[PDB]
């Protein structure tokens, strides 16, 4: 058996555990036999190339499947009535009524209705026909092939980079900030000015004419003259019909603010100046570090020099440079945390300030996008903490970090965990007490006895942004404030028009239910942070197991001795925190979907009166919106929601299956497999057939992971089916 060629210990396993553990440790290159650091970095570089190629192939596949089987050319003409098609259906297990019921979108074959929002994004950036969609798919296929060839090439001899090249922090930071962030943003601003804005104004720009069709009538002469404000003159009129010249302006760079009154999305000129400014700022950031020419900053000197002289941080940040450069897991945790924060930021800011034309009226698409990127955010943050725990297990050198900030985290880890526990118990005790209190007093016929705290802090913030609903009369809601007079000539009219109109999701009105659900969200975030931080900081050892770092990041237990040591590793803390992450994104998406459905229905008072107690959530959101989902198929017929009606139940099945690997444990199943081995060995006409690997029960860590996987898949598929089918049944 030589499948796990990277592990001799796994390859000598005589049982079925070998295949599973080779599958689960295949990409754990640091644990492989005889792995050196240079080989590790080169394999990581090529794997990153392969993932980039996979992303490009997926995007090219989306573009191609739309150019072939979509209705983009029909959808551009009538964006607010035509249902967008994701891809075609060819399933031979279908009966005829299922073929009939999925034939939508103005085509003659069964199709799925798109929820990804690629129509609005591609239409906003200037694609109009199916031809350029196919050309973009071809370009991304070619780009993916180029990156596959680069991944092969940069592993070939005399091209394999050295460890000094990989650990060049200053050069990589300068090039990735100035070029990968800055010049990419400048080029996207260029694409918006040169292509997207003219196509938004009904004038065709492609590769055949973009060198002869000026983005602005005055050309680049106002840019080279320093009369840049000429590019701000004659913006798009409030009567502008998107994709046509009727009411179109000539400006290419404005900061008008608010939304286009027809598309209910941000002005494209604002997006172009934003990405231009982001490019300029990032190129200015990308000249900061010294690479070859004496000027620039040194990262080691900046880290060592910022030690506060009062001694409250100890030695400050001395040794953090080598600890960060030498540990890929510390870097991975930092990157995953920052990525999770910004995809949460994307999820909040894109529903609140949409940039794609007509996507604010596509309720299913907004729900799917928010839910998707928020679940991605939870996964990324959990991964950040998990790989930080791996950094403490594998890479943390105390002797290189004497009196460091990391060492001082470790020296007051008990205070951190105890105060996290205190705030988690505080939040849970009083939030659950208010919710149960409201339930009990509403059930007894006295809703006037509820404890309803007005969220005056966030309402004050909304008034500071210009919301005149609450009468706070402060900052942008004050017509005499210095901020109001400062911004009155630039952006205040459009922003005030967008924030004080109740037709969008810009700073939606909030009440006691919003207060309670944000404090529940704070409870869940603090508790997940408690589990993850306690796992990371106790990863090296505890009072029950002071030599945990000798046993690695993942192991089942330390035996029944010393009272019992079940789930003591930091991997087990990851495993416990995954449920709480699913709970937190569940609460967030429940709040988002119920509030947005009640506003879209014109029945926001139902949310305002029912969200203060749990029975309102169970009845008016879960039970009430389940009716089109559970009627996707029935004894009277079926319709297009039936697949979600299947998938919903599918989730309710697979979620439950996870429980069996999380409740029942190993020895029972192992003895059953002994009985099955005896049965197969003693049965005639079947003992002629022999297994090559001995059948064994799944290991403890493997069973925890498999139960987690079935649980998580059920969670995701159940909520996705519910949100899409419910939004479609109410609004589509």
């Amino acid at each position: 058996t030589k499948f796990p060629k990277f592990s001799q210990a796994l390859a000598q396993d005589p049982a079925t555990r070998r295949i599973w553990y080779g599958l689960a440790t295949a990409h754990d290159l640091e644990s492989h036999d005889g792995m050196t650091e240079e080989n590790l970095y080169q394999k990581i570089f090529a794997s990153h190339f392969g993932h980039l190629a996979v992303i490009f192939l997926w995007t090219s596949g989306n573009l191609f499947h739309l150019a072939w089987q979509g209705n983009f050319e029909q959808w551009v003409l009538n964006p607010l009535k035509v249902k967008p098609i994701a891809h075609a259906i060819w399933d031979p297990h279908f009966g005829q009524p299922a073929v009939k019921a999925f034939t939508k979108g103005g085509v003659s074959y069964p199709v799925n209705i798109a929820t990804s929002g690629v129509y609005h994004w591609w239409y906003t950036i200037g694609m109009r026909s199916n031809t350029d969609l196919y050309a973009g798919s071809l370009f991304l296929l070619f780009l993916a092939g180029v990156f596959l060839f680069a991944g092969w090439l940069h592993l070939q001899p005399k091209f394999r980079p050295g460890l000094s090249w990989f650990k060049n922090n200053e050069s990589r930071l300068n090039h990735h900030l100035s070029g990968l962030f800055g010049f990419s943003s400048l080029a996207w601003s260029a694409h918006l000015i040169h292509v997207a804005i003219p196509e938004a104004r009904g004038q065709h720009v492609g590769w055949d004419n973009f060198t002869k069709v000026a983005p602005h009538p005055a050309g680049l002469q106002p840019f080279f003259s320093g009369n840049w404000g000429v590019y701000a003159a004659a913006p798009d009129t409030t009567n502008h019909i998107f994709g046509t010249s009727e009411g179109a302006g000539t400006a290419i760079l404005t900061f008008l603010g608010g939304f286009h009154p027809q598309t209910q999305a941000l002005w494209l000129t604002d997006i172009a100046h934003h990405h231009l400014a982001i490019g300029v700022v990032f190129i200015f950031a990308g000249h900061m570090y010294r690479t070859n020419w004496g000027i620039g900053h040194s990262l080691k000197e900046i880290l060592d020099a910022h030690r506060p002289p009062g001694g409250r941080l100890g030695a400050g940040h001395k040794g953090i440079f080598e600890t960060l450069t030498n540990s890929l897991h510390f870097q991975l945790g930092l990157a995953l945390a920052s990525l999770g924060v910004i995809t949460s930021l994307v999820a909040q800011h894109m529903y609140a300030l949409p940039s794609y034309a007509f996507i604010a009226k596509d309720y299913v698409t907004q729900s799917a996008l928010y839910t998707h990127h928020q679940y991605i955010a939870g996964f990324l943050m959990v991964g950040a903490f998990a790989h930080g725990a791996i950094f403490f297990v594998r890479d943390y050198d105390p002797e290189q970090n004497k009196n460091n900030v990391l060492a001082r985290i470790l020296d007051h880890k008990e205070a951190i965990i105890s105060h996290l526990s205190w705030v988690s118990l505080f939040l849970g005790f009083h939030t659950l007490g208010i919710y149960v209190h409201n339930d009990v007093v509403v059930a007894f016929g006295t809703p006037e006895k509820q404890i309803l705290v007005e969220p005056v802090f966030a309402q004050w913030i909304q008034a500071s942004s210009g919301k005149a609903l609450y009468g706070f009369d402060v900052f942008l809601s004050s017509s005499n404030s210095v901020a109001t007079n400062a911004s009155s000539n630039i952006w205040l009219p459009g922003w005030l028009e967008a924030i004080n109109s109740g037709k969008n999701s810009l700073f939606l009105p909030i009440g006691p239910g919003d207060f309670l659900i944000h404090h529940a969200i704070a409870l869940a975030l603090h508790t997940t942070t408690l589990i993850l931080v306690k796992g990371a900081l106790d990863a090296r050892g505890s009072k029950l197991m002071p030599d945990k770092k000798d046993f690695g990041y993942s192991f089942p237990c330390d035996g029944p001795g010393r009272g019992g040591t079940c789930d003591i590793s930091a991997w087990d803390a990851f495993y416990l925190s995954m449920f709480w992450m699913l709970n937190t994104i569940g609460w967030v998406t429940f709040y988002w979907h119920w509030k947005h459905v009640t506003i879209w229905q014109g029945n926001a008072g139902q949310f305002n009166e029912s969200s203060t107690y749990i029975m309102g959530w169970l009845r008016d959101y879960l039970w009430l919106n389940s009716s089109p989902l559970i009627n996707g198929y029935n004894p009277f017929g079926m319709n297009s929601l039936s697949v979600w009606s299947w998938m919903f139940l599918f989730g309710h099945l697979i979620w439950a299956t996870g429980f069996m690997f999380l409740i029942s444990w190993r020895g029972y199943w192992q003895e059953l497999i002994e009985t099955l081995v005896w049965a197969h060995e003693r049965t005639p006409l079947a003992n002629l057939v022999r297994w090559k690997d001995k059948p064994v029960a799944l290991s403890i860590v493997q069973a925890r992971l498999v139960g987690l996987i079935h649980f998580t898949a059920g969670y995701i598929f159940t909520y996705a089916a519910f949100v899409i089918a419910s939004t479609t049944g109410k609004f589509g």
């Binding site: 394999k43 090529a46 794997s47 190339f49 392969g50 190629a53 192939l57 191609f64 150019a67 072939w68 050319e73 199916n130 031809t131 196919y134 798919s137 071809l138 296929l141 070619f142 993916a144 092939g145 596959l148 060839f149 991944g151 092969w152 592993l155 070939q156």
Partner: peptide
């Protein structure tokens, strides 16, 4: 709309990408 020849061109490019992906997988497998 898209024709048969365009789909065939996309299939040829995807086959080229398949060959390159197989080569990258063989290079990573040592």
């Amino acid at each position: 709309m898209i024709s048969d020849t365009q789909i065939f061109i996309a299939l040829i490019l995807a086959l080229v990408s398949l060959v390159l992906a197989i080569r990258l997988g063989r290079a990573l497998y040592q």
